[PDB]
A paper describes a structure:
We have focused our work on the iron(II)/α-KetoAcid-dependent Oxygenases (αKAOs), a mechanistically diverse superfamily of enzymes that use dioxygen as the oxidant to catalyze several reactions via C-H bond activation, mostly hydroxylation. These enzymes operate with three substrates, dioxygen, α-ketoglutarate (α-KG) and a primary substrate. One of these, KDO1, catalyzes the formation of (3S)-3-hydroxy-L-lysine, while five others, KDO2 to KDO6, promote the formation of (4R)-4-hydroxy-L-lysine. We based our analysis on the structures that we solved by X-ray crystallography of two of the regiodivergent αKAOs active towards L-lysine, namely KDO1 from Catenulispora acidiphila, that catalyzes the C-3 hydroxylation, and [name], from [name], that catalyzes the C-4 hydroxylation.
The structure of the [name] form of KDO1 was determined without iron in the active site, lost during purification, while [name] retained the iron throughout. While a ferrous ion is present in the [name] [name] structure, it is not the case in KDO1 [name] as the metal is lost during the purification from the KDO1 preparation used to grow the crystals. In all four molecules of each of the [name] structures, an iron ion is present in the active site chelated by two His (176 and 312) and one Glu (178). Of these, Arg145 is instrumental in the recognition of L-lysine, as it is able to attract the substrate towards the end of the pocket where it can be maintained during the reaction.
Author numbering: 17 to 230, 241 to 372
Amino acid sequence: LTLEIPTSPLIIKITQQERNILSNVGNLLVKAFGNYENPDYIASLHLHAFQLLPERITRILSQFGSDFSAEQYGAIVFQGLIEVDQDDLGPTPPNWQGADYGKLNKYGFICSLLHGAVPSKPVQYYAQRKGGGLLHAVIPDEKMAATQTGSGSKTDLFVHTEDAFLSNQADFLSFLYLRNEERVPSTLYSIRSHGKMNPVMKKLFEPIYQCPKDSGPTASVLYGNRELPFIRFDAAEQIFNENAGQTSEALGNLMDFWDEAKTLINSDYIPNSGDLIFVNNHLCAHGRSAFIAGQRIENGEIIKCERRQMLRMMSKTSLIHIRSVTRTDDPYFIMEEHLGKIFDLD
Ligand SMILES: [Fe+3]
């Protein structure tokens, strides 16, 4: 049988009963542990994940965790994982620093269980908001509108795997949409959409590429299995950056790759409130189209709306492997700065 090349993510329609289970489990964990960063909760995370998640989610995520086959896209859309009460959530804060984690506590529990069922362990990075906790609120900040960050809006966020500049980048990501009233499409790009290993892709296994953090060590864009590889890629940071410092050969290879890759980008899915996108950060890159925060256009008219709000959680399947880059007193806190180099604070 000829290979069925994946061009889009797996879509799971979460049922009302599953949504009810998740809500009650979220509430129980809040009462039992206070918050999702409780060391007793984190230490018994996988036990809580397999015992408390709706069983179909547990089966999906378990299958996904160990699936690096030719058929695997590397992303799952869980449609309507949660019901967001928009009025209780109230207005979106001016930036991520104004997020009410007391209100997002239950969501943090739900997201950590999803990672826990992979199985994978939520982690935080000093490279991202000086850690900023296991759960990040991704909000369009008017001051950062034209930036190539999660606090951006007016500009296209070109496809990238999270933290391509780190040797210990996240294994898994979850993006929980609380609101997307601007109807911003989610953009995904899978290395598996290319199909069979070709000459353009083979050049990416060479450890000759700059992975700029946002004289420098170089890394491979493709790694892992030679036939069915893993990817570390950031189009904006490695290609569309004058200060990337790529060699003539490396830039050519990346340009050739980008030409082939850009035709495979999937921007079909527009997330709704309560959808969660779950990603294997070694298989699938993500991005977001340009938008004006707090508005959408319908019939050539501007409809004012509440500003985009999404929750991001990152995880690693092994605490052992990352142990030389984590805090002595916190094996879930990654202190890596750039491709092996650790942040030198004092
Ligand atoms: Fe990202």
